[PDB]
Design a protein around this nucleic acid. Sequence first.
DNA 1: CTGTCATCACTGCG
DNA 2: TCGCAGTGATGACA
Length: 204
Amino acid sequence: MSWRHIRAEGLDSSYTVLFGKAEADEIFQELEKEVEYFTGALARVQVFGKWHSVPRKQATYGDAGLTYTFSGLTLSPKPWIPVLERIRDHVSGVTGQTFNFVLINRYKDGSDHICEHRDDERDLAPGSPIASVSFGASRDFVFRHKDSRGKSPSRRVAVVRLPLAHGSLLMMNHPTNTHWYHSLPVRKKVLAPRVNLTFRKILL
DNA sequence: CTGTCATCACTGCG
DNA sequence: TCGCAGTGATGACA
């Protein structure tokens, strides 16, 4: 296997194609059958005083007895299902990193997206990495430095762009989520779904 | 309880 | 098609 080291000021991530095509295809099929996504209130978000649907489907799974915060609410993730344990075990076996929680984001096509944000959701263990595993359609991913955002940014730190491919792993290491925001921009020419899994080590 | 800070995705452009 | 500029109610935190 080959790893691409992604490096910039305050940015430390690693990228590899972790699952081969055949295995990644099988995993994607099973995820599409089995993952149960949020409906109702959890699929709505208020932004600048206006209510919208979250522009992607979401779900959480994790170890028994864990709780987390999802927009002002204390929730329990769903118990692990085998396909998720399979993915987690391969990531852990390869990297030596351990996780007890996963957030799943499903992008139905290129019109589903996520805006600039940090995973400084800190139900997280201090300094622990997040493993971002992708299945389905390739989608463009963008890292932007915290001081390079908006109309008149204080600094002009170069944007880091890469596509996240089917079966890929992007390890995001501290302090990436302190100094950088990431996003998945709208790509209208993408017609196929993508499932992204971000494995995390959350506090007990 | 109070005040500062970060936050999320859309519309309406260009 | 892409992406910038402008839009605030709400929770975390000390």
